[PDB]
Design brief:
Four copies of one chain form a homotetramer.
Chain A: E1 6-9, H1 16-30, E2 34-37, H2 42-50, E3 58-61, E4 97-98, E5 101-102, E6 105-106, E7 108-109, E8 113-117, H3 131-139, E9 144-146, H4 153-160, H5 180-194, H6 204-212, E10 216-221, H7 226-231, E11 236-239, E12 243-244, E13 247-248, E14 257-260, H8 267-278, H9 281-290, E15 295-296, H10 299-305, H11 309-320, H12 333-345, H13 351-382, H14 389-394
Parallel strand pairs in A: 1-2, 9-10
Antiparallel strand pairs in A: 3-14, 4-5, 6-14, 7-15, 8-10, 8-11, 12-13
PDB class: immune system
Keywords: inflammasome, immune system
Assembly: tetrameric
Chain lengths: ~400, ~425, ~425, ~425
């Protein structure tokens, strides 16, 4: 680790030079050089580059895959002014809340939104319960109402959690698929499949191909999919997700966050650059020019971009949507939802039996996984006397 | 990506891939079957993946070091070599390729360690290990050393370790060889930290009289002058040194509709007095499997020495851990001196069988991990592959799974988290 | 033999089997033979024959203690078909069925002169019997040996005809368990009635009918109740599936006389007076031999014990009672307490069963190599030929060959 | 609280601890009842984890360290002025992690016991043992017989020329530094087994074989502690104990255990002990009344040890304890006991050489405990599935208690929830 200057590590999602273009505004006005770098495999270098104290002082990544950094406790806290915590939506600071204090800075926001063909469906439904009758009307014209990815729990969980449902009780303690409100949401979904308003084999590609070829009226996707539906000429709107039993569908919210290192000796100067330069109207648009940040959580700027109705509804779904879990890497809980949807959609179990078995099949999958990690930890500790070769030694030929 | 009527062959860029191209189109001239010879971005792994989904080479060109993984997964078709064409290939050059009573493919080249000496520093090499310390006695007046080879890899050390004489790496004769190896180190005829880079760099500049290497090194040695000879490895106690012998073979896919014409290329065209030399012109094969034309090369005394060394050597181990790590740290500990030679052998043997225990409880825990994934049908894998998973016996479930996963949602991230 | 069946009653061969043959031999009953012979042949020694309950001989067959047995087609028709499947284990017969045991509906002829033949009569007829201060039916529900007959009454047989995880989530176990729990919500029966609470209810005489086999018969004799026993009620046109325990004679695999054990068991023990002599000391109950069983069937309860066993369920051959008992254990208590739905309780207990049995053999595997390492280091100084025996035993039974070597059993290193 | 309860092993002077304990009719007006349950050291941790048990417990110091990691005890509060009245090395014996744990009572170590009618002056070196046994074998006897099966008896000679169990670093016995493979460990070990291969000793002798042969006059010497003394006074031998012989000029180092006591962590009366201890038990007549019943051997206090030292047997016990060094407190000591012993057996059998049997034993030991922890974890996760499934009907207060306990002792907590499922892994 070095002192005298500040740095930044970002990928090719958002403009690598837009941040540079805002980068030298800092050093032009201050004199502290800010190098801006884009390491290949950023999410795979940081806990490596930081655990010994080296690396950046600040850094950028998402909030959904952020459960590998906070667990090793590295990102230092920030005492932002109350006047600063009032520049972004009050619910944004919870997405980067940990142990009680801060862990990074919100910049923008990402969430699933209801996408509908405006010519096929001029007024999209606001209610899940009215789509089966709507679909029957549309299948007589050769179309389907709603087609989105049923394979990944990321898309299907909002409806399963629509009735009094949410990921955690606030921290594991157990898998969160037990509540009887998920029975109601999962029942409705497996019905849309068994009554043939939906197919259980619909993946992301099939749902995307059906919408831009104009074969379906609605689909579930995020701002990342907006690029490919504009190549097609389908006239589409973007609105809030449909409600169920009166409660709104709440998707997962991914938020890019500007964390800063605890081994970082330029703590404050990193605050001055992010708070007073990056995180206001002038800084983001330098970033937003090279590549769009999507909806940004900064009230000042979001509203002027909220003139785009797609970006405004993307955020509206995010404010209601609940925060992407701090226990992730996509396992445990993720495994219980997916196996519950698959077995119930094919009719092997009623939904009551499916998610009850799928959840204890999840917790007992991770007692096997962590058991296997230990014997291999003991394996690895033995040959220390002398990363994928462990696959051909254990997936070898002989028994 | 499969096809009927073409032959596609894949080989490392180690080997002349142009040579096979040279032999390839001559095939399509006398026949009409257009052949394509590529050396894809690292074929050692890409093959098992694309084998399982059915595509890939019709003929795969490789050694019999790692064909364990290929035959038993069952996607390298069985062979039918006529008896009239048998009787030529060395009695032993198949034993290496013969797996599970049935033949996997046909061997081409044979590669083995050979004692490499220059003729400038000493005219005629010593034929046994025990006299090396005495000859080394007066090669330092000039300032030079007699022998430097790689001591880190068991591939080089094991020929001397087991030169004298489950069972285990700890035996009465393994002491003898190991004891002689480390006593050379304590007298500064050799150093425990000498690796492949140091040993080859010293001989190629000519301050070492003898080395132990294979024909893969001869390219760099030819390029760096040094008038050198190649002979049989030094004897220990009276028993010959037995190096690990790789035979480089030609596997053919089991998903290939053209398996008849795949042989037609290897049998009557590839392995001949002519087409063999065609690939070897651009790539030194060392010794070769055919006999009608192995002895042309045997005029070259360098290639003859490796053949005599290969006929005495063992077949490489085909399982890439345990015993290999036992011999490694047994040599490492005793060479640095911090543990007695017999203390190192005892400590190596218990770490080895404890390595295999810790290894195969992981394989049992692993087999349990995927038995749970197939049952929950998290994958939606075809009902055929799920019952076919449950039909296969316990040890091969791991392979039936991943071939029932390369098919297509992916469960490759579930498995790569397990490690 | 053991001390619960006839030692001398079967030792009376010297007076018959042996005289014709000139082959002197005779039994003796070591006490607590439960887990005591698993190793006298683990040598090649041991007796030629052993009798004991069919509970679990499969653990003593794949480990190589029981050879294949020779019943002729004419001799197999001398015993009931269902008892051959008791000792039939992976396609081979490893023993000779002698006597069998099963549940039966215990009626009494004063409250209800004609007992119910189906299960749906008892909710509707329990009414009559409810009011007057009693109850029509009640039995142990806290251990699945009693609850499984009705739960599995509609559906597949599971064990009669590979053994690992047939599964309890079948739609029939729903109908069985749903009907049973519907009996509790209508208060035809209460959720907390195990063995003694159920027997004391019938031995203090405030319930009409019960479920239990022959081992309890004497307790109803002493308490003044006039009862018989009959066949269990059918559930949805299909008979109930009570667990059929069998007493069978297996003959060792290292035995010297493979065919002399068969010639004696088949033509001398398994004949009318052969099994009789031991039935004189013993109420052998229902016997597998159709010839004599018909004469014991004068007792209408042995005929009912038999009839319930013919269509009954064969006892778990392997160590399945580790997962299955537990699978059908936790499924009932979680469902009867209203904590889970019948469907949620079945699939959970199903998957809870096979994933804890996986942990257990895994714990067996790491312990086996833990104990195996202890004998390679000679830390215990095992008299050597107590240690070749350990190294040459089957990788599974190796952990009990190690107990042979020297009661007291420490190992408390794990606890 | 209100009363004082004592646990002490049944082999000690437990009732001699009542005469001293019944003398509490002074200002304390509090009574004590001494109690001697067997398996006591096993039972205290499991019941004191729930907050019950005696106030003070007399036990060897080696297991007090395994207790205090779980916080089964409480902070000690000795004054530094009275700390000196004991022997300063005994304070390091019970000092654990940087703390105190107990108050020293007795010092216990091995010593050379000889037959004077057979052997008038003992040898002071191990090197002259083989020549002395050569003379006694001519007369039908042997020089030395002691238990070779347990490394506690063989450790003094294996450690003379610079052998140690775990190296004391700062306040801590270095666990990556094992001293059973040091130059003098080998020097002591071969000489131990050359005694066995030259037929001077025999690898089959255990404690029972040695004790009977020594008290029947069949051997001239034996190695034992103060516990075996009374059996030798019943014997017909005129015996005495003395220094242990030196090896290569250095004296042997026997393991020094101290019998001492603690004050329960959740105990309701912690200050009430401290007097019984600090002021009473530990006074000249305090230990005299328990040495009255069953002798304590060497005591940490001076003014009564000095009275005891006039009998040369306890003076030899204390002196052999001075050159000996304290037994570590740490769970890895069992891996030490396993490593040293399997090395002795295979070296005494000629099965392996001494350098070879030592190395094969050491990594056998830690590879064995690797399987132990792996066996404890699959067990721990296995019983978690048993209580979470409610198969054995508990919940009430016994279920969340178990689940809130830290994972490491989710076992002991579970089988003290037995208000049955035993060795099901042997089926």
């Amino acid at each position: 680790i070095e002192e005298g200057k500040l740095v930044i590590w970002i990928n090719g999602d958002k403009g690598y030079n837009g941040l540079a273009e805002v980068g030298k505004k800092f050093e032009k006005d201050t004199g502290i050089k800010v190098t801006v770098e884009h390491p290949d495999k950023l999410e795979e270098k940081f806990p490596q580059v930081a655990a010994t104290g080296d690396g950046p002082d600040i850094i950028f990544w998402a909030h959904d895959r952020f459960g590998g950094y906070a667990q090793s406790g590295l990102l230092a806290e920030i005492t932002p002014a109350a006047a600063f915590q009032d520049k972004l939506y009050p619910f944004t600071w919870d997405a980067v809340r940990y142990n009680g204090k801060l862990i990074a800075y919100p910049i923008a926001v990402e969430a699933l939104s209801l996408i509908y063909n405006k010519d096929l469906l001029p007024n999209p439904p606001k209610t899940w319960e009215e789509i089966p009758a709507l679909d029957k009307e549309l299948k007589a014209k050769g179309k389907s109402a709603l087609m989105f990815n049923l394979q990944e729990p990321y898309f299907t969980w909002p409806l399963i959690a629509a009735d009094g449902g949410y990921a955690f009780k606030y921290d594991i303690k157990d898998v969160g698929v037990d509540n009887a409100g998920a029975k109601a949401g999962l029942t409705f979904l497996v019905d849309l499949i068994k009554n043939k308003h939906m197919n259980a084999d619909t993946d992301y590609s099939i749902a995307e191909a059906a919408f831009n070829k104009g074969e379906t009226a609605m689909t579930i996707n995020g701002p990342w999919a907006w690029s490919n539906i504009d190549t097609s000429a389908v006239n589409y709107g973007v609105t809030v997700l449909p409600t169920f039993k009166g409660q709104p569908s709440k998707p997962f919210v991914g938020v890019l966050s500007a964390g800063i290192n605890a081994a970082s000796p330029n703590k404050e100067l990193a605050k001055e650059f992010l708070e007073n330069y990056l995180l206001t109207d002038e800084g983001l648009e330098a970033v937003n020019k090279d590549k769009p940040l999507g909806a940004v959580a900064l009230k000042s700027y979001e509203e002027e971009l909220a003139k785009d109705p797609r970006i405004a509804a993307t955020m509206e779904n995010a404010q209601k949507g609940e925060i992407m879990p701090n226990i992730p890497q996509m396992s445990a809980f993720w495994y219980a939802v997916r196996t519950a949807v698959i077995n119930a959609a094919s009719g092997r179990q009623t939904v009551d039996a499916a998610l009850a078995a799928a959840q204890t099949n999840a917790v007992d999958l991770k007692v096997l996984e962590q058991l296997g990690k230990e014997v291999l930890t003991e394996y690895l500790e033995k040959l220390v006397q002398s990363g994928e070769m462990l696959l051909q030694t254990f997936f070898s030929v002989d028994p």
